[PDB]
């Protein structure tokens with residue numbers, strides 16, 4: 001018996017899936033065509049992570065600041081999310097993947113929140129790769145949710161202000177039950193982390209590639225892992 | 232009359248001054264020799280920032296996790312900090328630079344805390360470049376200090392848990408009165424931000440160079456600014 005053990009201890013990879021709009025515009029197409037093509041890269045990246053023994057893969061699909069995008073571009077994205085979930089959930093379940101969405105799902109329409117809740121419940125018992133989709137997520141928002149939780153406990157007389165330290169807040173941010181983020185990959189050419197997992201990437205390796213998200217493939221993923229192994 | 236206006240709106244640069252140990256080891260010297268040489272790069276980087284109209288320059292000099300280094304290597308660093316302050320404060324004052332140390336200065340010896348307090352008081356009225364030296368600083372520690380401040384206010388019945396949002400916490404993290412960080416440069420070849428300004432770099436451009444901190448010069452700084460202007 002022998003499992004796949006990712007290069008030099010890599011446990012949790014997070015990817016900022018950027019470059020979809022640019023990939024479509026370069027071909028004279030609308031942005032939504034690039035995001036749809038980006039759904040194929042998600043499937044491939046998830047397959048690669050699960051098949052290589054990565055414990056957790058966290059994908060930045062929609063930020064807390066992207067509501068400022070064109071309205072109809074946003075609605076198309078919500079419908080794509082629903083479609084992507086329907087296209088993949090059964091497969092996720094079969095492959096022992098545990099799905100979690102991180103971010104403020106209250107702002108989503110009913111049909112979408114319903115699909116999210118169902119997909120997580122169905123795979124809640126799975127023990128392989130944990131796949132986290134960050135949708136309507138911000139690193140600062142994440143930290144603030146944890147802070148409010150500690151502030152509720154202070155009011156209730158259940159915690160003194162001077163007892164709050166890093167480990168306590170760390171237990172209230174998203175993904176605190178998972179391995180810390182080891183490697184962040186950002187496709188698309190920009191060199192910013194854009195409010196992604198601020199608290200959790202304190203010590204992560206950061207890897208930027210000019211490859212655009214819809215073109216990102218297994219060889220590109222192996223490439224980031226090798227930079228990690230050597231880095 | 233005409234001021235220097237840094238490329239495309241750059242207001243605040245933060246630098247992770249890494250590669251000092253490696254720079255010394257490559258020449259067969261002890262790490263402390265590399266940090267001393269690194270003090271010359273600080274002087275040059277401060278001169279470049281002030282002369283080019285940068286509003287704030289924030290330098291990572293000692294992290295909240297570096298106490299785990301060799302004891303005597305740590306004591307040598309504290310003495311270097313004292314010496315560097317004595318060598319530069321008068322000059323800082325003459326050049327209209329406002330000095331601030333960010334980090335937990337309680338852990339420092341008396342002589343050092345005294346020099347820090349004096350240097351800040353002397354330049355507190357200055358209006359040119361604000362130079363922030365992050366010493367015994369961690370991004371997570373920074374956030375936690377702000378959280379404790381909001382938790383003290385909740386206890387006092389001065390704030391409800393549900394009133395805490397991003398802007399409120401933002402007003403309690405280090406450097407909240409300054410422009411947000413526009414560009415982070417890390418010398419030395421590693422691609423990590425290492426618990427530096429987590430909250431504040433949410434949207435900063437990140438620039439990594441293999442140049443080691445003691446070799447970092449004005450042309451290297453112009454190079455990062457140009458990547459920023461084009462990036």
Ligand SMILES: C=C(C)CCOP(=O)(O)OP(=O)(O)O
Pocket residue numbers: 016017018019060061062063065066190192194434
């Ligand atoms: C790829 C995702 C989901 C988010 C980050 O890209 P953004 O375009 O939202 O933010 P910036 O590039 O403007 O930094």
Ligand SMILES: C=C(C)CCOP(=O)(O)OP(=O)(O)O
Pocket residue numbers: 203247248249250291292293294296297421423425
């Ligand atoms: C250059 C400074 C002051 C801090 C960051 O370097 P560290 O060596 O402390 O942390 P890692 O490289 O281990 O990520």
Ligand SMILES: [Mg+2]
Pocket residue numbers: 018190
């Ligand atoms: Mg963008």
Ligand SMILES: [Mg+2]
Pocket residue numbers: 249421
């Ligand atoms: Mg190091």
